[PDB]
Design a protein around this ligand. Structure first.
Ligand SMILES: Nc1ncnc2c1ncn2[C@@H]1O[C@H](COP(=O)(O)CP(=O)(O)OP(=O)(O)O)[C@@H](O)[C@H]1O
Ligand SMILES: Nc1ncnc2c1ncn2[C@@H]1O[C@H](COP(=O)(O)CP(=O)(O)OP(=O)(O)O)[C@@H](O)[C@H]1O
Ligand SMILES: N[C@@H](CCCC[NH3+])C(=O)O
Ligand SMILES: N[C@@H](CCCC[NH3+])C(=O)O
Ligand SMILES: [Mg+2]
Ligand SMILES: [Mg+2]
Lengths: 31, 506, 501
């Protein structure tokens, strides 16, 4: 195929750094 | 009851609520849990259940208000594509006085907050039994009682909020649209593409054939054009050494409005170094089939082009996609040989295609150029055969000012278009990196622009210079997001997948 | 040699390659491996080692052509912000005649593909030793032997070829946007697109671009903010929306201003600006930590040889209240907050602006005076991320009145390095109050405030169908990009910035 290039970021996704908890949960629309 | 009367009366009522310090527009209501999670948590409850040891705050919009006593009032709370019953009993409310007061306040359409216990009616309808109901935002207008939903497109498209309240499927269309866009980003990100932003205002528009929007910059005393495609910028980036780029963004066309046409639309473009259009066909197959399967659960989808009052097509996105070569297949459809492909720039050719269009009753409004006549013929004879995803390949150079010449077939280019349901969703080619050829082609384009054609494009010299610094062998690709959205939400009309579509006023 | 002659000579030479059919612009070269993966795989090689069982195709641009002579040449091949040595010696090539032909063909700047073997030199340099070298795309110009800012911003491709750090800035920009999307997506937000051309421009204070729609005989305005559409969608029942998109201003092109720029706007139902303060702390702090590795960031607002500021994004962020801290910084008491719509107050603020030498161009409205005073006394204290809160309603026509302090609104702006990066507030959902404020704005636009707002009657109607308690938020991505790439120019974070030809 085409040569591998590593993803600039990941390997997503972040907010594994930070998710606030002051507001009720809605689920990720993509899941 | 008359909606204007209703509005006058209700506005008065709310005003009264304001002057009494009864606070009809509170600042903060603390929601404990989504309606969705509430349902998922307490659905297991038996008819007659009433959790005394669990108290929760939910919010939403009242869809209905009905009585079963003077001490019993049921509200239909809606939110998140979902419903919960509010069983308001006098015995469970904080006061008889306040129960009476709040039930006198509330009308259908109001945004409320509810603090109450989970329960389920004797009938078996999951409900919340309120200690207190709070008016969060009143609806001043009368929401229509409709048998067949809001059907009036004027209302639906101008007041999208009404459409979203009164029709449940709208929400899901825009969810699907988001899923598409996000899926694409994830696909490309994982292949090492860098997401970029290029200018939406330029001094000369390029990248496609279209009539542009013109605006004026005051401080600089010059006209800027709204962009038709980010193409040339991306190719410059690849010259600068960024090997894989993409941008999902808005494009502008000063045309008219039809079922597949809005003045502003969303496209994705990517450019990939050391790729050719065969690589792009393979990636496209993977991306489109993957997308469809991931979003809908299957490779097969159904489409109603003429609406639900019409035929259903079964569309199979199972790879690999059918491939056809434009010229050969056009010949095969016409049942006639067309001129040699190295002879497409000639007047003999133009005359032949003109005659064929006349004889096959295919209209081509002026200018009846070879390229246009070709396009109309392809639209008539090939594009209609493209129900399942079909690549139409190897376009003539006269239709493709920025595509690299074909390495076997003279007069053709290494280009393809993806068709689904008779409409184009992708356009891609091995990119032209020879500065000289590119300049010649720009010159023929500018010559055609001199005769009066406002869609045929300008000469970007900066781009030609950039090509002179060395654009690597590269393949590029564009996709019409809105169209993909249409075909995945079974919408026969682009106004369906734009939140606020352009409307000719009333 | 002379560049305009180099170009003619090269043009001729490449043309000759064309007419001879040696194919200077080949259609397809198959790269087997990235330069980065090549290096990662074969950096571990001992010097003088030479893997012969491995043959690989790589590609890139030529930054230098140096010959030991005469059977040997070294090529400095760059791509991806890395470099690889091509050690071309005659005995390893496919043929000595082809070796000579191909070396006589190549120049610096050329895109080439290399097929060959991995191996280090005795000197220690990781290299590829070519069986064959193919010309992929000739560079017809003299490449510079690049600091001049105008020349970089006008020929961004040269900048990216020659300067390594630019690519890194744009990667950081992309990481910022991607982070934001991950953050909101995971919080249950729907990513949406609202119109970029309107009939009435709304949402912010700005001077619009006007353009004409031919087939409707109607003028349309390019947008300054997506705000009113988002609020309409929350009315529609979509509780959490966001949009990272372009915005337009017919204004001055400068060090920190571009006519088009990128914002992120999000709206959240059943939230207030306190909630939004927590969310902002978490998002920005986490963003910075994720991108840079630390909460700590050094910034140079004027030059790399100028004052360096050390910024701590560790939450919680400092909070100041606008009127209170202005009273502290002015050494005096300001009018009671419920008096701010009086010309008494306007006159007092005008006198205070004069007395402390603060320039307010006309029209000297209460809001513009107030803004100038905040700019002077308050914003300059905001090095570390600082929330400036509780703006007066005269500055905030779409913000909901404060629930204690009459005359104030439930609003904050986030400041880093004396510059605003966020603007957020508890949304005004009262259709009557909103109509009134629009009317006041329209009065101030008839008496010549040029950026002052118009009257969206449709927006007002939407509000009448009922907007739930909601809090909204906006961020200037371009500024965050400047601050995380140590750029004091906005041109540094826009690939193709607007130039004044
Ligand atoms: N107003 C618009 N709305 C939606 N998409 C548009 C658009 N204008 C252009 N596009 C996109 O850009 C592409 C341009 O298609 P073209 O072949 O140049 C003219 P067309 O009218 O779309 O085809 P046709 O005239 O043969 O039916 C389309 O595939 C479409 O996805
Ligand atoms: N021309 C421009 N370039 C970059 N950002 C801009 C901009 N115009 C407005 N903004 C954004 O909008 C916010 C401030 O807007 P303004 O109301 O115009 C205050 P200003 O700084 O005096 O200009 C900032 O967060 C900034 O990111
Ligand atoms: N800019 C093109 C799409 C990219 C084609 C491949 N370079 C268009 O508007 O159709
Ligand atoms: N539209 C605002 C941001 C949104 C503020 C919250 N409604 C601005 O231009 O700054
Ligand atoms: Mg087409
Ligand atoms: Mg400001």
């Amino acid at each position: 195929p085409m040569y591998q290039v590593k993803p600039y970021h990941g390997g997503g996704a972040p907010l594994r750094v930070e998710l606030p908890t002051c507001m009720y949960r809605l689920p990720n629309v993509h899941g | 009851v008359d909606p204007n009367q209703y509005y006058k009366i209700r506005s008065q009522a709310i005003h009264q609520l304001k002057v009494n310090g009864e606070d009809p527009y509170p600042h903060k209501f603390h929601v404990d849990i989504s309606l969705t999670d509430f349902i998922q948590k307490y659905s297991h409850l038996q008819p007659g259940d009433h959790l005394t040891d669990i108290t929760l705050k939910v919010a939403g919009r009242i869809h209905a208000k009905r009585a079963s006593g003077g001490k019993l009032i049921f509200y239909d709370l809606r939110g998140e594509g979902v419903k919960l019953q509010v069983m308001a009993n006098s015995r469970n409310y904080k006061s008889e006085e306040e129960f009476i007061h709040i039930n006198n306040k509330l009308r259908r359409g109001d945004i409320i907050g509810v603090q109450g216990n989970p329960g389920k009616t004797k009938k078996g309808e999951l409900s919340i039994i309120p200690y207190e109901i709070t008016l969060l935002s009143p609806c001043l207008h009368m929401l229509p009682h409709l048998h067949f939903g809001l059907k009036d497109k004027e209302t639906r498209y101008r007041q999208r909020y009404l459409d979203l309240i009164l029709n449940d499927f709208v929400r899901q269309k825009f969810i699907i649209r988001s899923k598409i866009i996000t899926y694409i980003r994830s696909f490309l990100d994982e292949l090492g593409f860098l997401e970029i932003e290029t200018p939406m205002m330029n001094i000369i528009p390029g990248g496609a054939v279209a009539k542009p929007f013109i605006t004026y910059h005051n401080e600089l005393d010059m006209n800027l054009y709204m962009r038709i495609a980010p193409e040339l910028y991306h190719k410059m980036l690849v010259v600068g050494g960024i090997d894989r780029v993409y941008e999902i963004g808005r494009q502008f066309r000063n045309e008219g409005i039809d079922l597949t046409h809005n003045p502003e639309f969303t496209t994705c473009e990517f450019y990939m170094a050391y790729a050719d259009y065969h690589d792009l066909m393979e990636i496209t197959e993977k991306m489109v089939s993957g997308m469809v399967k991931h979003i809908t659960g299957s490779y097969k989808v159904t489409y109603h082009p003429d609406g639900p009052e019409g035929q259903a097509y079964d569309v199979d996105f199972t790879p690999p996609f059918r491939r056809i070569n434009m010229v050969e297949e056009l010949e095969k459809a016409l049942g006639m040989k067309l001129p040699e492909t190295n002879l497409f720039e000639t007047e003999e050719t133009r005359k032949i295609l003109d005659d064929i269009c006349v004889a096959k009753a295919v209209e081509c409004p002026p200018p009846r150029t070879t390229a246009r006549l070709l396009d109309k013929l392809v639209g008539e004879f090939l594009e209609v055969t493209c129900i399942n995803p079909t690549f139409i390949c190897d376009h003539p150079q006269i239709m493709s000012p920025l595509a690299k010449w074909h390495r076997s077939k003279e007069g053709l280019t290494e280009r393809f278009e993806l068709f689904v349901m008779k409409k184009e969703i992708c356009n891609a080619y091995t990119e032209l990196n020879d500065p000289m050829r590119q300049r010649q082609l720009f010159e023929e384009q500018a010559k055609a622009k001199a005769a009066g054609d406002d869609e045929a494009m300008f000469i970007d010299e900066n781009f030609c210079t950039a090509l002179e610094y060395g654009l690597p062998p590269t393949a590029g690709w564009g996709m019409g997001i809105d169209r993909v959205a249409m075909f995945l939400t079974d919408s026969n009309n682009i106004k369906e997948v734009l939140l606020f579509p352009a409307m000719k006023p009333e």
